[PDB]
Design a protein around this ligand. Structure first.
Ligand SMILES: Nc1ncnc2c1ncn2[C@@H]1O[C@H](COP(=O)(O)O)[C@@H](O)[C@H]1O
Ligand SMILES: Nc1ncnc2c1ncn2[C@@H]1O[C@H](COP(=O)(O)O)[C@@H](O)[C@H]1O
Ligand SMILES: Nc1ncnc2c1ncn2[C@@H]1O[C@H](COP(=O)(O)O)[C@@H](O)[C@H]1O
Ligand SMILES: [Mg+2]
Ligand SMILES: [Zn+2]
Ligand SMILES: [Zn+2]
Ligand SMILES: [Zn+2]
Ligand SMILES: [Zn+2]
Ligand SMILES: [Zn+2]
Ligand SMILES: [Zn+2]
Lengths: 204, 205
């Protein structure tokens, strides 16, 4: 059944397809390599992301020496079946330099990681926490009583958009209000958003 | 120029291409993966529209040039070895030519059609299925506004108590998940996508 599936992949002249490893919990692109028929099959059977190293001319499972495996949860093919997503959860940092992902060379800021909207805000909140030990985040990080009251009150306002039939944009605006203040509490308690999303996934 | 010096450091392959991945700036969903040469990257930067090189037609191709479903690029990233590119952008419409939101919807373990979703947006999709099928806790919350809102306020209370009562970080993590779930049932009631919420956060930068 695996044989019938690998035959459908559109490989290039070298027998390769693009294989992208993505964090199953956050969506961050960890790394992008290449896979041949055997590299994808090994990923399927071993549940650890495996690629074809063109340089070393051999199969390569991420973590085989460093133990920073990418435990693969699902594999996706795009429409033309020439691109692959390894959707996995990494044991440690993915890049061989030690960086969390391989993408940290911004072209517009001309070393910061590539972050989507939710994880960039978490990163900003983290920077305020470091400069703590005039900012609204620093004010919340330095006042537990104010932060907790703000979370309770904003949660109240989110519900009032449902209870009082406010516009959908009002609900989104208040959900953002809840999300920001909760992440300031997350930072105080040393909790990453990824850990929270892992909890959600474990409750499936 | 500074961009020219940046394109010069890019390690292009023998035919002058590099892998280009389009990713949703707000959610992280991978929209599509193509290939870019210097001019596809340079034009992507200048026009702020994701532009690739169509190898089959052997010409430049801007995603959306016919369908108007452009990918409006917010950032461009190079990986460590500088042979892989991420166009980080916000798409006008569905990216795949079939109409799918993204191009990646062929699960391999289900073959041994669902979109590839990460945890937060998979929970959003599940809550959405419960809303349409309306013995499940989500359907019950969708059928009782007073109960749903009571649970949100109660769970937001519990999250604060983990800070107030010096509870363990695992307790904070567990309670934050509780707040997130019940909030997303309220989002589904008000027809709010998580992406819409994250756009608001991004707009408050
Ligand atoms: N994310 C990565 N992308 C490309 N090459 C890598 C990556 N991580 C490690 N390597 C290299 O691949 C080999 C396997 O290392 P590792 O899988 O990290 O134990 C070593 O030569 C590493 O330097
Ligand atoms: N208290 C909770 N915290 C987080 N996720 C939850 C919770 N209750 C239900 N879920 C999620 O909702 C899904 C469907 O639940 P149900 O509507 O009871 O079938 C589960 O598989 C979980 O992912
Ligand atoms: N009231 C707020 N609601 C939502 N996001 C906020 C709020 N205040 C600050 N932020 C976020 O926190 C970042 C840093 O704010 P500050 O710590 O006040 O400099 C902003 O760029 C926003 O992304
Ligand atoms: Mg109000
Ligand atoms: Zn393709
Ligand atoms: Zn790397
Ligand atoms: Zn508010
Ligand atoms: Zn690379
Ligand atoms: Zn497509
Ligand atoms: Zn709880």
């Amino acid at each position: 059944a695996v044989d019938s599936l690998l035959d459908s992949v559109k490989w290039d002249n070298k027998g390769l397809a693009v294989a992208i490893a993505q964090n199953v919990d956050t969506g961050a692109i960890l790394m992008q390599g290449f896979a041949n028929r055997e590299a994808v099959a090994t990923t399927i059977s071993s549940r650890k992301a495996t690629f074809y190293s063109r340089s070393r001319s051999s199969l390569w499972t991420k973590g085989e020496t460093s133990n920073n495996f990418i435990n693969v949860h699902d594999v996706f093919l795009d429409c033309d079946r020439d691109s692959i997503i390894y959707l996995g959860k990494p044991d440690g940092p993915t890049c061989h330099t030690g960086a969390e992902t391989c993408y940290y060379t911004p072209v517009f800021d001309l070393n910061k990681l590539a972050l989507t909207s939710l994880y960039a805000l978490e990163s900003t909140i983290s920077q305020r926490k470091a400069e703590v030990v005039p900012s609204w985040t620093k004010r919340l990080l330095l006042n537990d009583k104010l932060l907790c009251s703000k979370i309770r009150e904003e949660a109240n306002e989110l519900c009032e958009t449902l209870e009082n039939n406010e516009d959908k944009s009002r609900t989104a605006s208040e959900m953002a209000d809840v999300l920001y203040h909760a992440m300031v509490l997350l930072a105080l308690k040393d909790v990453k958003v990824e850990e929270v999303l892992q909890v959600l996934r474990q409750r499936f």
